[PDB]
Amino acid sequence: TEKEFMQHARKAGLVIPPEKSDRSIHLACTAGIFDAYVPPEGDARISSLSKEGLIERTERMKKTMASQVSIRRIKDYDANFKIKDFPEKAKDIFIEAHLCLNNSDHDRLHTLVTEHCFPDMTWDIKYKTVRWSFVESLEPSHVVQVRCSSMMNQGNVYGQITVRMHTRQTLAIYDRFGRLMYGQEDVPKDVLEYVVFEKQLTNPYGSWRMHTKIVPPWAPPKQPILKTVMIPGPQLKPEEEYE
């Protein structure tokens, strides 16, 4: 008649690697992006080949010179690397990543993308099914900004490559029971996005993995939800509501 309950644990991950130890952590990515790319306002209106040049072309020339010196740096650090076939490589990497995400593949998606965008693409979809498929590409992809950092924390540098992409996707997000929820079936919709790829240069191997995607503030709204969303107000505590 003298027994209690055991099993005393917590469900929270605190700090414990760097508390009196001699082994650090060898990361393979970074936090966010280095510099946010600012697309032009008239991108949708001038979606053809080219147009007339604007006034004061010094800023674009400076950005081009920065991209060229970053390419020179990444070529001096690691030779044998092209730029013209880089958009095609990024395109096929994005396609195979979307395909392996549709086929519910993790051991390949972990090495296809970086350690940053994987939770954003595996959290609110783990208990759901997707029917994504590629149909046809419209405007070819091009590179808009080439940058690289020089963080001397653990002797690791990275090279984020912002490459725009414009094509047509087919999204079909169902529910865990089998009913439709978000997108429709076969609908060749048109949407563009700016995807950036980051590669660990200091790694002895290095694989071009998708870092993240930046959405412009002037982007059109997404398609509405097929269900009804309820937005309740705050909890009215015994007092008074002034709003």
């Binding site: 009215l236 015994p238 008074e240």
Partner: protein
């Protein structure tokens, strides 16, 4: 007393699952015209009750802060006020207890 045998699970089910021991479903639950926090017939709402209890507690706190020590009990009536609101003419001989908040809509 001591049993000669043992009751079965069937007898236990017949004894504990009878409609006499089961909780009856009451049909006196409705809604409230004000606030609305699920009240009952012939029973006051808990939300407005808590509100008026907090208000009475605050008024008693203010009275105790104005009176000070115990054993007082004034021989005149009392009247509570709020933000602003000048005292009327028929409230001269009554004790004025002003608060520090706006006047509610349920207190006239």
């Amino acid at each position: 007393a001591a049993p000669k045998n043992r009751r079965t699970i069937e007898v236990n089910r017949c004894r504990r699952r009878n409609p006499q021991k089961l909780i009856k479903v009451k049909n006196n639950i409705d809604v409230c015209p004000e606030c609305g926090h699920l009240k009952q017939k012939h029973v006051l709402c808990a939300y407005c009750y808590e509100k008026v209890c907090k208000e009475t507690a605050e008024i008693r706190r203010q009275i105790g802060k104005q009176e000070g020590g115990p054993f007082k009990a004034p021989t005149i009536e009392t009247v509570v006020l709020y933000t602003g609101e000048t005292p009327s003419e028929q409230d001269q001989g009554k004790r004025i207890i002003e608060r520090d908040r706006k006047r509610p809509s349920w207190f006239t």
